[PDB]
């Protein structure tokens, strides 16, 4: 018998921001030090990793809004 | 029997920002040091890694908004 | 039996920004040092890696907005 | 009447050391940071001072012995 | 009346050391940072000073012994 | 009346060291940074000063012994 598929998603959505004078941002870290000894690492399927890191972040978005979507349909 | 596939996704969406005078940003890091000794690393499928980092980030987007989507249809 | 596919996607979507006087950005790192000793690395499918990094980033986009989309149809 | 001075000090003293294999010394400080705002300092006679300091010292003398002597004679 | 002065100090003293294999010394500092704003400093007689310092010292003398002597005669 | 001065000091003293295999010294700093804003400094008699320093020192003498002496006669 016949198969029919009608894939017609519609997306009218909006992600939006208003900000004023975004500014006067100072990031001044005092150095640091790291040592790593590493042996025999196996990373095998969608692993996210960090080892030894001494990281400094100043993240200041005027908006920074996130919309994350999955629409999964499976047939068998 | 017959197979018919219609594929007509319609995307009218928007990602948008207004910002004022974005500025006066200072990033002045104080050096630092790293040593890494590394052996026998096996990374095998969509791995994300860092070893021994000393990373400084200043990130100041006027918007920085994100829309991330998966629409998935699987048939068998 | 017949196979028919009608692939007619539509995209009228938009990514947009307005910013004022984008400026007065100072980035001045104080050097630093790295050493890496590395042996026997196997990276085998879409691996993202770094070893030893001492990285300084100053990212200040007037917008920095992102729209990321996948629209997947699989048939078998 | 006559004045006579006979300045004849004698110094046979000794300051001495024996040491073995002086070594295997590691000094690896993790950076740091300092800020000082300073105004109107008057230092007027044999002042010893420090302000804001973040100092690291590894002092490992094989001997490190001290002899300090004053011999003052005053006549009026 | 007569003045007579006989200045005949005698110095047979010794400062001395023996050391073995002086070595295997590592000094590896992780950067750092300093800022100083300074105004109107008056330093007027044998002042010893420091402002803002981030100093690292590794001092490993095979001897490092000190003899400090003052022999003062004052007549009036 | 007569003035007589007999200045005949004697110095047979010694400063001495013996050392083995002096070596294997590593000095490797990780950068760093300094800023100094400075106004109106008056330093007027045998002043020792430093402002803003980020100093790294590795001092490894086979001896490093010191003999410091003052032998003062004052007459009035």
From Swiss-Prot, chains A, B, C, D, E, F:
Site (described: Not glycated): 8, 14, 18, 28, 37, 40, 67, 72
Modified residues (N6,N6-dimethyllysine): 8
Domain of life: Eukaryota
Stretches forming Tau/MAP repeats: 3-33, 34-65
Subcellular location: Cytoplasm, Cytosol; Cell membrane; Cytoplasm, Cytoskeleton; Cell projection, Axon
UniProt modified residues of type N6-acetyllysine: 8, 14, 18, 28, 40, 44, 66
Modified residues (Phosphoserine): 2, 21, 49, 53
Lineage, top ranks: Eukaryota, Metazoa, Chordata, Craniata, Vertebrata
Free-text tissue specificity from the UniProt record: Expressed in neurons. Isoform PNS-tau is expressed in the peripheral nervous system while the others are expressed in the central nervous system.
PTM annotation (Omega-N-methylarginine): residues: 46
Role, per record: Promotes microtubule assembly and stability, and might be involved in the establishment and maintenance of neuronal polarity. The C-terminus binds axonal microtubules while the N-terminus binds neural plasma membrane components, suggesting that tau functions as a linker protein between both. Axonal polarity is predetermined by TAU/MAPT localization (in the neuronal cell) in the domain of the cell body defined by the centrosome. The short isoforms allow plasticity of the cytoskeleton whereas the longer isoforms may preferentially play a role in its stabilization.
Quaternary assembly: Interacts with MARK1, MARK2, MARK3 and MARK4. Interacts with PSMC2 through SQSTM1. Interacts with SQSTM1 when polyubiquitinated. Interacts with FKBP4. Binds to CSNK1D. Interacts with SGK1. Interacts with PIN1. Interacts with LRRK2. Interacts with LRP1, leading to endocytosis; this interaction is reduced in the presence of LRPAP1/RAP.
Disease: In Alzheimer disease, the neuronal cytoskeleton in the brain is progressively disrupted and replaced by tangles of paired helical filaments (PHF) and straight filaments, mainly composed of hyperphosphorylated forms of TAU (PHF-TAU or AD P-TAU). O-GlcNAcylation is greatly reduced in Alzheimer disease brain cerebral cortex leading to an increase in TAU/MAPT phosphorylations. Frontotemporal dementia 1: A form of dementia characterized by pathologic finding of frontotemporal lobar degeneration, presenile dementia with behavioral changes, deterioration of cognitive capacities and loss of memory. In some cases, parkinsonian symptoms are prominent. Neuropathological changes include frontotemporal atrophy often associated with atrophy of the basal ganglia, substantia nigra, amygdala. In most cases, protein tau deposits are found in glial cells and/or neurons.
Cross-link Glycyl lysine isopeptide (Lys-Gly) (interchain with G-Cter in ubiquitin) per UniProt, renumbered positions: 8, 14, 18, 28, 40, 44, 50, 66, 72
Entry remark concerning the domains of this protein: The tau/MAP repeat binds to tubulin. Type I isoforms contain 3 repeats while type II isoforms contain 4 repeats.
Covered range of the whole protein: 621 to 696 of 758
UniProt PTM comment: Phosphorylation at serine and threonine residues in S-P or T-P motifs by proline-directed protein kinases (PDPK1, CDK1, CDK5, GSK3, MAPK) (only 2-3 sites per protein in interphase, seven-fold increase in mitosis, and in the form associated with paired helical filaments (PHF-tau)), and at serine residues in K-X-G-S motifs by MAP/microtubule affinity-regulating kinase (MARK1, MARK2, MARK3 or MARK4), causing detachment from microtubules, and their disassembly. Phosphorylation decreases with age. Polyubiquitinated. Requires functional TRAF6 and may provoke SQSTM1-dependent degradation by the proteasome. PHF-tau can be modified by three different forms of polyubiquitination. 'Lys-48'-linked polyubiquitination is the major form, 'Lys-6'-linked and 'Lys-11'-linked polyubiquitination also occur.
Residues glycosylated per entry: 44, 50, 66
Protein name: Microtubule-associated protein tau
């Amino acid at each position: 018998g016949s198969v029919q598929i009608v894939y017609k998603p519609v997306d009218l959505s909006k992600v939006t921001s208003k900000c004023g004078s975004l500014g006067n941002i100072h990031h001044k870290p005092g150095g640091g030090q790291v040592e790593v000894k590493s042996e025999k690492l196996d990373f095998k399927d969608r692993v996210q990793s960090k080892i030894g890191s001494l990281d400094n972040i100043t993240h200041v978005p005027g908006g920074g809004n996130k919309k994350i979507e999955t629409h999964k349909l499976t047939f068998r």
